[PDB]
Design an enzyme around this catalytic site. Structure first.
Site, PDB file in Angstrom:
ATOM      1  N   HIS A 177     -16.486  -4.072  48.030  1.00  0.00           N
ATOM      2  CA  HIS A 177     -16.083  -4.176  49.425  1.00  0.00           C
ATOM      3  C   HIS A 177     -15.881  -2.820  50.061  1.00  0.00           C
ATOM      4  O   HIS A 177     -16.102  -2.673  51.264  1.00  0.00           O
ATOM      5  CB  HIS A 177     -14.801  -4.980  49.560  1.00  0.00           C
ATOM      6  CG  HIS A 177     -14.965  -6.425  49.235  1.00  0.00           C
ATOM      7  ND1 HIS A 177     -13.895  -7.267  49.027  1.00  0.00           N
ATOM      8  CD2 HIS A 177     -16.077  -7.184  49.095  1.00  0.00           C
ATOM      9  CE1 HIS A 177     -14.342  -8.482  48.765  1.00  0.00           C
ATOM     10  NE2 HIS A 177     -15.662  -8.459  48.803  1.00  0.00           N
ATOM     11  N   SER A 227     -22.776  -3.457  49.652  1.00  0.00           N
ATOM     12  CA  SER A 227     -23.942  -3.575  48.792  1.00  0.00           C
ATOM     13  C   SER A 227     -25.036  -2.615  49.233  1.00  0.00           C
ATOM     14  O   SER A 227     -25.021  -2.084  50.345  1.00  0.00           O
ATOM     15  CB  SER A 227     -24.485  -4.999  48.801  1.00  0.00           C
ATOM     16  OG  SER A 227     -23.548  -5.891  48.234  1.00  0.00           O
ATOM     17  N   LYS A 269     -29.062 -19.015  51.181  1.00  0.00           N
ATOM     18  CA  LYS A 269     -29.975 -18.552  50.139  1.00  0.00           C
ATOM     19  C   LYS A 269     -29.322 -18.646  48.773  1.00  0.00           C
ATOM     20  O   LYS A 269     -29.990 -18.906  47.768  1.00  0.00           O
ATOM     21  CB  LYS A 269     -30.417 -17.118  50.435  1.00  0.00           C
ATOM     22  CG  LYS A 269     -31.444 -16.547  49.473  1.00  0.00           C
ATOM     23  CD  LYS A 269     -31.862 -15.138  49.893  1.00  0.00           C
ATOM     24  CE  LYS A 269     -32.865 -14.529  48.916  1.00  0.00           C
ATOM     25  NZ  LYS A 269     -33.274 -13.134  49.263  1.00  0.00           N
ATOM     26  N   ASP A 270     -28.007 -18.461  48.724  1.00  0.00           N
ATOM     27  CA  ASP A 270     -27.277 -18.716  47.495  1.00  0.00           C
ATOM     28  C   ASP A 270     -27.287 -20.196  47.153  1.00  0.00           C
ATOM     29  O   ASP A 270     -27.525 -20.573  46.002  1.00  0.00           O
ATOM     30  CB  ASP A 270     -25.847 -18.213  47.638  1.00  0.00           C
ATOM     31  CG  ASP A 270     -25.774 -16.717  47.756  1.00  0.00           C
ATOM     32  OD1 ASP A 270     -26.762 -16.050  47.389  1.00  0.00           O
ATOM     33  OD2 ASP A 270     -24.742 -16.196  48.213  1.00  0.00           O
ATOM     34  N   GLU A 310     -28.299 -15.695  16.900  1.00  0.00           N
ATOM     35  CA  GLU A 310     -29.241 -16.134  17.907  1.00  0.00           C
ATOM     36  C   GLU A 310     -29.776 -14.931  18.666  1.00  0.00           C
ATOM     37  O   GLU A 310     -29.421 -13.779  18.403  1.00  0.00           O
ATOM     38  CB  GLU A 310     -28.610 -17.160  18.833  1.00  0.00           C
ATOM     39  CG  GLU A 310     -27.334 -16.729  19.490  1.00  0.00           C
ATOM     40  CD  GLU A 310     -26.760 -17.829  20.364  1.00  0.00           C
ATOM     41  OE1 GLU A 310     -27.531 -18.693  20.819  1.00  0.00           O
ATOM     42  OE2 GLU A 310     -25.537 -17.846  20.598  1.00  0.00           O
TER      43      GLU A 310
HETATM   44  C1  HEM Z   1     -20.015 -11.469  34.205  1.00  0.00           C
HETATM   45  C2  HEM Z   1     -20.579 -10.332  34.602  1.00  0.00           C
HETATM   46  C3  HEM Z   1     -20.740  -9.952  36.079  1.00  0.00           C
HETATM   47  C4  HEM Z   1     -20.403 -10.606  37.168  1.00  0.00           C
HETATM   48  C5  HEM Z   1     -19.733 -11.976  37.345  1.00  0.00           C
HETATM   49  C6  HEM Z   1     -20.778  -9.798  38.268  1.00  0.00           C
HETATM   50  C7  HEM Z   1     -20.570 -10.189  39.525  1.00  0.00           C
HETATM   51  C8  HEM Z   1     -20.987  -9.425  40.527  1.00  0.00           C
HETATM   52  C9  HEM Z   1     -21.065  -9.866  41.881  1.00  0.00           C
HETATM   53  C10 HEM Z   1     -20.697 -11.246  42.432  1.00  0.00           C
HETATM   54  C11 HEM Z   1     -21.503  -8.863  42.582  1.00  0.00           C
HETATM   55  C12 HEM Z   1     -21.749  -8.867  44.091  1.00  0.00           C
HETATM   56  C13 HEM Z   1     -23.212  -9.213  44.283  1.00  0.00           C
HETATM   57  C14 HEM Z   1     -23.976  -7.933  44.438  1.00  0.00           C
HETATM   58  O1  HEM Z   1     -23.338  -6.886  44.706  1.00  0.00           O
HETATM   59  O2  HEM Z   1     -25.222  -7.962  44.288  1.00  0.00           O
HETATM   60  C15 HEM Z   1     -21.717  -7.778  41.680  1.00  0.00           C
HETATM   61  C16 HEM Z   1     -22.174  -6.586  42.079  1.00  0.00           C
HETATM   62  C17 HEM Z   1     -22.430  -5.588  41.229  1.00  0.00           C
HETATM   63  N1  HEM Z   1     -22.208  -5.620  39.886  1.00  0.00           N
HETATM   64 FE1  HEM Z   1     -21.412  -7.081  38.781  1.00  0.00          FE
HETATM   65  N2  HEM Z   1     -21.348  -8.639  37.850  1.00  0.00           N
HETATM   66  C18 HEM Z   1     -21.330  -8.725  36.492  1.00  0.00           C
HETATM   67  C19 HEM Z   1     -21.789  -7.816  35.617  1.00  0.00           C
HETATM   68  C20 HEM Z   1     -22.075  -6.566  35.995  1.00  0.00           C
HETATM   69  C21 HEM Z   1     -22.405  -5.500  35.098  1.00  0.00           C
HETATM   70  C22 HEM Z   1     -22.493  -5.648  33.572  1.00  0.00           C
HETATM   71  C23 HEM Z   1     -22.640  -4.442  35.848  1.00  0.00           C
HETATM   72  C24 HEM Z   1     -23.009  -3.001  35.491  1.00  0.00           C
HETATM   73  C25 HEM Z   1     -22.734  -2.486  34.300  1.00  0.00           C
HETATM   74  C26 HEM Z   1     -22.427  -4.820  37.198  1.00  0.00           C
HETATM   75  C27 HEM Z   1     -22.580  -3.956  38.209  1.00  0.00           C
HETATM   76  C28 HEM Z   1     -22.618  -4.387  39.473  1.00  0.00           C
HETATM   77  C29 HEM Z   1     -23.091  -3.606  40.567  1.00  0.00           C
HETATM   78  C30 HEM Z   1     -23.627  -2.174  40.474  1.00  0.00           C
HETATM   79  C31 HEM Z   1     -22.972  -4.336  41.642  1.00  0.00           C
HETATM   80  C32 HEM Z   1     -23.348  -3.954  43.077  1.00  0.00           C
HETATM   81  C33 HEM Z   1     -24.865  -3.913  43.190  1.00  0.00           C
HETATM   82  C34 HEM Z   1     -25.282  -3.603  44.603  1.00  0.00           C
HETATM   83  O3  HEM Z   1     -24.463  -3.820  45.530  1.00  0.00           O
HETATM   84  O4  HEM Z   1     -26.438  -3.153  44.811  1.00  0.00           O
HETATM   85  N3  HEM Z   1     -22.087  -6.134  37.287  1.00  0.00           N
HETATM   86  N4  HEM Z   1     -21.392  -8.135  40.402  1.00  0.00           N
HETATM   87  C1  HEM Z   2     -17.911 -17.256  29.209  1.00  0.00           C
HETATM   88  C2  HEM Z   2     -17.622 -18.506  28.853  1.00  0.00           C
HETATM   89  C3  HEM Z   2     -17.822 -19.024  27.421  1.00  0.00           C
HETATM   90  C4  HEM Z   2     -18.495 -18.510  26.405  1.00  0.00           C
HETATM   91  C5  HEM Z   2     -19.351 -17.235  26.327  1.00  0.00           C
HETATM   92  C6  HEM Z   2     -18.327 -19.388  25.302  1.00  0.00           C
HETATM   93  C7  HEM Z   2     -18.880 -19.213  24.095  1.00  0.00           C
HETATM   94  C8  HEM Z   2     -19.077 -20.291  23.325  1.00  0.00           C
HETATM   95  C9  HEM Z   2     -20.232 -20.532  22.533  1.00  0.00           C
HETATM   96  C10 HEM Z   2     -21.444 -19.610  22.409  1.00  0.00           C
HETATM   97  C11 HEM Z   2     -20.064 -21.676  21.926  1.00  0.00           C
HETATM   98  C12 HEM Z   2     -21.046 -22.358  20.975  1.00  0.00           C
HETATM   99  C13 HEM Z   2     -21.588 -23.593  21.674  1.00  0.00           C
HETATM  100  C14 HEM Z   2     -22.063 -24.549  20.620  1.00  0.00           C
HETATM  101  O1  HEM Z   2     -21.927 -24.203  19.425  1.00  0.00           O
HETATM  102  O2  HEM Z   2     -22.564 -25.650  20.953  1.00  0.00           O
HETATM  103  C15 HEM Z   2     -18.803 -22.188  22.332  1.00  0.00           C
HETATM  104  C16 HEM Z   2     -18.276 -23.344  21.923  1.00  0.00           C
HETATM  105  C17 HEM Z   2     -17.035 -23.676  22.291  1.00  0.00           C
HETATM  106  N1  HEM Z   2     -16.352 -22.992  23.254  1.00  0.00           N
HETATM  107 FE1  HEM Z   2     -16.861 -21.574  24.458  1.00  0.00          FE
HETATM  108  N2  HEM Z   2     -17.545 -20.433  25.654  1.00  0.00           N
HETATM  109  C18 HEM Z   2     -17.225 -20.224  26.954  1.00  0.00           C
HETATM  110  C19 HEM Z   2     -16.430 -21.022  27.676  1.00  0.00           C
HETATM  111  C20 HEM Z   2     -15.459 -21.632  26.975  1.00  0.00           C
HETATM  112  C21 HEM Z   2     -14.123 -21.870  27.411  1.00  0.00           C
HETATM  113  C22 HEM Z   2     -13.557 -21.447  28.764  1.00  0.00           C
HETATM  114  C23 HEM Z   2     -13.497 -22.463  26.414  1.00  0.00           C
HETATM  115  C24 HEM Z   2     -12.063 -22.978  26.342  1.00  0.00           C
HETATM  116  C25 HEM Z   2     -11.548 -23.623  27.385  1.00  0.00           C
HETATM  117  C26 HEM Z   2     -14.423 -22.638  25.352  1.00  0.00           C
HETATM  118  C27 HEM Z   2     -14.147 -23.232  24.177  1.00  0.00           C
HETATM  119  C28 HEM Z   2     -15.138 -23.597  23.340  1.00  0.00           C
HETATM  120  C29 HEM Z   2     -15.073 -24.674  22.405  1.00  0.00           C
HETATM  121  C30 HEM Z   2     -13.880 -25.615  22.178  1.00  0.00           C
HETATM  122  C31 HEM Z   2     -16.216 -24.733  21.771  1.00  0.00           C
HETATM  123  C32 HEM Z   2     -16.501 -25.765  20.674  1.00  0.00           C
HETATM  124  C33 HEM Z   2     -17.931 -26.261  20.685  1.00  0.00           C
HETATM  125  C34 HEM Z   2     -18.680 -25.449  19.672  1.00  0.00           C
HETATM  126  O3  HEM Z   2     -18.158 -24.383  19.263  1.00  0.00           O
HETATM  127  O4  HEM Z   2     -19.789 -25.868  19.271  1.00  0.00           O
HETATM  128  N3  HEM Z   2     -15.617 -22.103  25.708  1.00  0.00           N
HETATM  129  N4  HEM Z   2     -18.207 -21.324  23.195  1.00  0.00           N
END
Ligand code: HEM
Ligand code: HEM
Ligand code: HEC
Ligand code: FES
Lengths: 62, 106, 241, 379, 81, 67, 54, 54
Positions: free
Chosen positions: D201, D205, D227-228, D271
């Site tokens: 902000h 962007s 568009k989103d 994986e």
């Molecule tokens: C769960 C992971 C992430 C989420 C939820 C996330 C979410 C967002 C969102 C909603 C925006 C605003 C949309 C936009 O600016 O295009 C944004 C912007 C941005 N994010 Fe993150 N982002 C994630 C990961 C990352 C990572 C890993 C990086 C860099 C290491 C990153 C760098 C940026 C940058 C540079 C912007 C602004 C880009 C621009 O305005 O041109 N984001 N991110």
């Molecule tokens: C970024 C969000 C999340 C990631 C990266 C993640 C990661 C994972 C992954 C990779 C699995 C394996 C899925 C499978 O084996 O079928 C898993 C399973 C599971 N995750 Fe998450 N999870 C997320 C969200 C959540 C949240 C928010 C919770 C708790 C509220 C949760 C609890 C569990 C449980 C209970 C399982 C059991 C099913 C299983 O392991 O096979 N996950 N999670």
């Protein structure tokens, strides 16, 4: 000359947003009752005699 | 030691200059520049005649990119004509700080 | 590194996208397990709840169940039961214990067949072609006694004595049992077992797709409809300048 | 501000971080991910919750429970896959959000970038434990080494490993811990997001041309929202199709067998996205020196903004940079497939071949690029 | 600062646009659009494909290279000795 | 009895060339083995080759041939 | 809410999740509750405008 | 562990074999109680001065 249903429709419904909103649920109701009813036939049309619905008649209540 | 190759250098220059689309969007070289601090105050010292014109082309540019149209090639910028207007201002801001930067060393 | 064979791709009544299973063959495919596989490999994960899926009448499946179960239930009022009662009961193991399994199998450990399908590579066709494939040991190769050469088999020597021959049994259908038919019948059976949801899960699968094409353009239009004013802009640079 | 209904709770005036947040005109569907990323996550939380509702973490229980889930639980089959398969989608959603940053040089914003950096590192372990939770054959063995991996610390590692274990082995408590970790952890991320966003902000962007957009802005609500919406709707089928008709495709792990410490799998792989690192991991015979690289692998991202070499941010005008850019793209995807290979002699060479290339692409080539090109345009 | 007010300073620009109803959702989207698809697709495909070639080559190259290397034990050393 | 469709469909594909073609290799192996089988040689490697494309043909046919 | 005719297992497990997550929610809410307070500031025991002295 | 069979025996096991399993459990429970009386006063203040006016 009569208005195409469009010209009727907005004047009739879409003008007041409530109505415009109201109809939305209305058809949506009748929609699904008919809609799902169609696809299953198509579905079960595709799979004939693979399902108890067809199969189970062979043995169902003897 | 380059004379004929110097002449040979410009082709790829002209070639490379033609290998970047902004030539084909009607931009110039200067407005391409990434911002910087020197960039900033450099902007200040511009007269509007350029400045405004700098603006519009940019504004013109952006719109086109929205619609994925490239400028009709006839109207593309020409490798013969590139306006350096930025840099004669740029060297000032570069220069002066180098002093301060240095004169404040010792 | 036994050359890893693949069972060739067989078409299937379910192989197609919207293609579903026949339960009739499944009815059979059970029988053989009911007959044979209960030898060693069990399936712990299945209740007698099958009823209408493989079309079995509850009474049938009930009576079908009630035959099967029957163990103790009177140990000083602490129990289990004879004679399952309900059909929620799972299917008795041939073995009390990995020990009783393995020793009886002579160091072999019969796997569960419940989920076995999605475990191994090569789908059900693996087993089908596996039970299909058994060959005489090529020139200059030896086996353990229990181990029987099979090319599909990873070590290509399998302790499993090939069960199937043409008409090992009779089918609940009464269709003449055929080593191939016998094989193919059970293949669907297990394949379904690991995926009871399957033939249903395509319903919405169908149902969603019909729904699906509707929305996408509408938005895309409205999208464009809003954006329309954007891409319709016109600039005029008229500095009085 | 007379009778504006957005003042009355001040909270609604914080809301105008959106609806009047201006944006440049030209924005590619490349930019739709930041949205999706947050959305991919929301679903996660929910589904990842309801799992637990019938889930039990116990050495004896967990598997049979998870067995029981798709069995007796209403729609236990849709949900589990919604969780797992939905996880996968979050990745490719994510990387693009990275890829955009580079290819236009959006990383020029330093701190916002860094937040993304940390933000990235977080997410992996989540899935990692999330992947152990199944307690499948691989999940046991997969973490078994990856955890045992860290023992290569010359000194303090010995205790420290068994410590995170809480034992001489993978035994129960080592499970239970993860559950908590894997459970809480997303909430943390969600918080961090609100930081990552926040700086944005400040400076707004960027635009594909890599040019100051000041002159032309857009009220956010009437447009990019839409568009989103479509962009959101894009995601639906992407999971829906996979999750429904053909579950097991990216469900590549084949292990529904109970985890056996006695049995060892003939093939051992995490994986996919877990592989490409693990591919580099396979490469170096030196145990310690190898791990050192794997660490250094990602973190250079934060280094990259030190590498701004030119007078134009975006790569759309630099062919060579673009030439370079796409070149690197493959080098990764190779390793992916390479890590997807047993360690026979061409692969052995191959990784060794492709490995040093990787950094070399980054660490040498890319900076010199503009240097020439800066000189080329005579800049 | 205040987002729409103070950003830039601009003078003597003019803008023209219509109600979205006044116009069509697809003004020759098919006919007129298809060329625009084509023209720009090549500007990339110049710089896009070349690596993708390389992998697939090496992919099969190694694949074969892998195969015979492994596949045949009595390849170089045949089973006379 | 019933003879199965299999054994029939077994023969229809093994009839194909590459089948008997490599089947020779089996014997090319085998016969040489028969004298030399003292040494490690075994025709299994070729058997799979023999059987591979063999049943790739057998694939489509018998699944129709069955019930 | 039971998920059953009785207090049986799943009725337990559910709560665990609920009881587990739930505080985080509160912590968020706190930051709301606080927030308004910054608007008008705290009050004083006398029930009198404190403006003059801070 | 939350399980119909496990949870109790586990919690039994906590104060038994777990390092300081005795301090911690009580820190949780007893600490809960304290939060209440802490809380009510925060209410009581509100009334007795009429801070609820906000
Ligand atoms: C769960 C992971 C992430 C989420 C939820 C996330 C979410 C967002 C969102 C909603 C925006 C605003 C949309 C936009 O600016 O295009 C944004 C912007 C941005 N994010 Fe993150 N982002 C994630 C990961 C990352 C990572 C890993 C990086 C860099 C290491 C990153 C760098 C940026 C940058 C540079 C912007 C602004 C880009 C621009 O305005 O041109 N984001 N991110
Ligand atoms: C970024 C969000 C999340 C990631 C990266 C993640 C990661 C994972 C992954 C990779 C699995 C394996 C899925 C499978 O084996 O079928 C898993 C399973 C599971 N995750 Fe998450 N999870 C997320 C969200 C959540 C949240 C928010 C919770 C708790 C509220 C949760 C609890 C569990 C449980 C209970 C399982 C059991 C099913 C299983 O392991 O096979 N996950 N999670
Ligand atoms: C001889 C008792 C017995 C019979 C009868 C029997 N099984 Fe087998 N089966 C075994 C044993 C023991 C093994 C493992 C032998 C080995 O590993 O060499 C085995 C192998 C298998 C395998 C493959 C194991 C793997 O590694 O994938 C499956 C599947 C299987 N049996 C299921 C079946 C099926 C289907 C049938 C009916 C055709 C059947 N069992 C009948 C004992 C039996
Ligand atoms: S240490 Fe076990 S494989 Fe490298």
């Amino acid at each position: 000359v009569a208005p195409t249903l469009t010209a009727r429709l907005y004047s009739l419904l879409f003008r007041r947003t409530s109505t415009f909103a109201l109809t939305i649920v209305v058809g949506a109701l009748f929609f699904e009752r008919a809609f799902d009813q169609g696809a299953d036939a198509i579905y079960e049309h595709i799979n004939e005699g693979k399902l108890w619905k067809h199969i189970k008649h062979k043995y169902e209540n003897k | 030691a380059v004379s004929a190759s110097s002449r040979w250098l410009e082709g790829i220059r002209k070639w490379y200059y033609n290998a970047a689309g902004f030539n084909k969007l009607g931009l110039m070289r200067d407005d391409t520049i990434h911002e910087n601090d020197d960039v900033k105050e450099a902007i200040r010292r511009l007269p509007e005649n350029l400045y405004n014109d700098r603006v519009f082309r940019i504004k013109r540019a952006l719109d086109l990119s929205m619609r994925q149209q490239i400028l009709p090639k006839e109207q593309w910028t020409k490798y013969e004509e590139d306006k350096s207007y930025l840099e004669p201002y740029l060297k000032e801001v570069i220069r002066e700080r180098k002093e301060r930067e240095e004169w404040a060393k010792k | 590194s036994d050359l890893e064979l693949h069972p060739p791709s067989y078409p299937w009544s379910h192989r197609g996208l919207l293609s579903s299973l026949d339960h009739t063959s499944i009815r059979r495919g059970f029988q053989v397990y009911k007959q044979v596989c209960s030898s060693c490999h069990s399936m712990d994960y299945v209740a007698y709840r099958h009823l209408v899926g493989v079309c079995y009448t509850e009474d049938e499946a009930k009576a079908l169940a009630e035959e099967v179960e029957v163990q103790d239930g009177p140990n000083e009022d602490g129990e289990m039961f004879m004679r399952p009662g309900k059909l929620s009961d799972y299917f008795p193991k041939p073995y009390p214990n990995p020990e009783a399994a393995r020793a009886a199998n002579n160091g072999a450990l019969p796997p569960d067949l419940s989920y076995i399908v999605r475990a191994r590579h090569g789908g059900e066709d693996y087993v089908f072609s596996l039970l299909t494939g058994y060959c005489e040991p090529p020139t200059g190769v030896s086996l353990r006694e229990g181990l029987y050469f099979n090319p599909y088999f990873p070590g290509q020597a399998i302790g499993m004595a090939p069960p199937i021959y043409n008409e090992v049994l009779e089918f609940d259908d009464g269709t003449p049992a055929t080593m191939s038919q016998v094989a193919k019948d059970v293949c669907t059976f297990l394949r379904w077992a690991a995926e009871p949801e399957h033939d249903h899960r395509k319903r919405m699968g169908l149902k969603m797709l019909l729904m699906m094409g509707l929305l996408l353009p509408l938005v895309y239009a409205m999208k464009r409809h809003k954006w329309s004013v954007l891409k319709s802009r016109k600039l005029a640079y008229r500095p009085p300048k | 501000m007379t009778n504006i209904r957005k003042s009355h709770p001040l909270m609604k005036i914080v809301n105008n971080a959106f609806i009047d947040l201006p944006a440049p005109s030209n924005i590619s569907s490349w930019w739709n991910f930041g949205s999706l990323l947050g959305i991919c996550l929301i679903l996660q939380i929910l589904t990842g919750l309801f799992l637990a509702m019938h889930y039990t973490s116990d050495t004896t229980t967990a598997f049979s429970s998870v067995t029981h889930i798709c069995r007796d639980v209403n729609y236990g089959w849709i949900i589990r896959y919604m969780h797992a398969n939905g996880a996968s989608m979050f990745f490719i959603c994510l990387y693009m959000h990275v890829g955009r940053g580079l290819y236009y040089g959006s990383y020029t914003f330093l701190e916002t970038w860094n937040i993304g950096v940390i933000l990235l590192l977080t997410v992996m372990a989540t899935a990692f434990m999330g992947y152990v939770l199944p307690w499948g054959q691989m999940s046991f063995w997969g973490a078994t080494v990856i955890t045992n991996l860290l023992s290569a610390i010359p000194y303090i590692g010995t205790n420290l490993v068994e410590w995170i274990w809480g034992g001489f082995s993978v035994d129960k408590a080592t499970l239970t811990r993860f559950f908590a970790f894997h459970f809480i952890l997303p909430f943390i991320i969600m918080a961090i997001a609100m930081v990552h966003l926040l700086f944005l902000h400040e400076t707004g962007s960027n635009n594909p041309t890599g040019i100051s957009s000041d002159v032309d802005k857009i009220p956010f609500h009437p447009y990019y929202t839409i568009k989103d919406i479509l962009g959101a709707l894009l995601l639906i089928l992407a999971l829906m199709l996979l999750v429904l008709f053909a579950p097991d495709l990216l469900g590549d792990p084949d292990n529904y067998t109970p985890a056996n410490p006695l049995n060892t799998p003939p093939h051992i792989k995490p994986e996919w996205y877990f592989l490409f690192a693990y591919a580099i991991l396979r490469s170096i015979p030196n145990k310690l020196g190898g791990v050192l690289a794997l660490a250094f692998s990602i973190l250079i991202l934060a280094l990259i903004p030190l590498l701004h070499t030119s007078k134009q941010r975006s790569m759309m005008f630099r062919p060579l940079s673009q030439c370079l850019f796409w070149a690197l793209v493959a080098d990764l995807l190779t390793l992916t497939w390479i890590g997807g290979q047993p360690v026979e002699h061409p692969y052995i060479t191959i990784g060794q071949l492709a490995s040093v290339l990787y950094f070399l692409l980054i660490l040498v080539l890319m900076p010199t690029a503009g240097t020439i090109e800066n000189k080329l345009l005579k800049w | 600062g205040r987002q729409f007010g103070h950003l830039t300073r601009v003078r003597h620009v003019i803008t023209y646009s219509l109600s979205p109803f006044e116009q069509r959702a697809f003004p020759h989207y098919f006919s007129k659009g298809i060329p625009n698809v084509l023209r720009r697709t090549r500007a990339c495909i110049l710089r896009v494909a070349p690596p993708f070639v390389a992998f697939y080559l090496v992919y099969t190259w190694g694949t074969q290279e892998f195969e015979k290397s492994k596949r045949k034990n009595p390849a170089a050393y045949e089973n006379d000795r | 009895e019933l003879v199965d469709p299999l054994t029939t469909v077994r023969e229809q594909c093994e009839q194909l060339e590459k089948c008997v073609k490599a089947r020779e290799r089996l014997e090319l192996c085998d016969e040489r083995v028969s004298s030399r089988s003292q040494t490690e040689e075994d025709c299994t490697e070729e058997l799979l080759d023999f059987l591979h494309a063999r049943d790739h043909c057998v694939a489509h046919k018998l699944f129709n041939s069955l019930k």
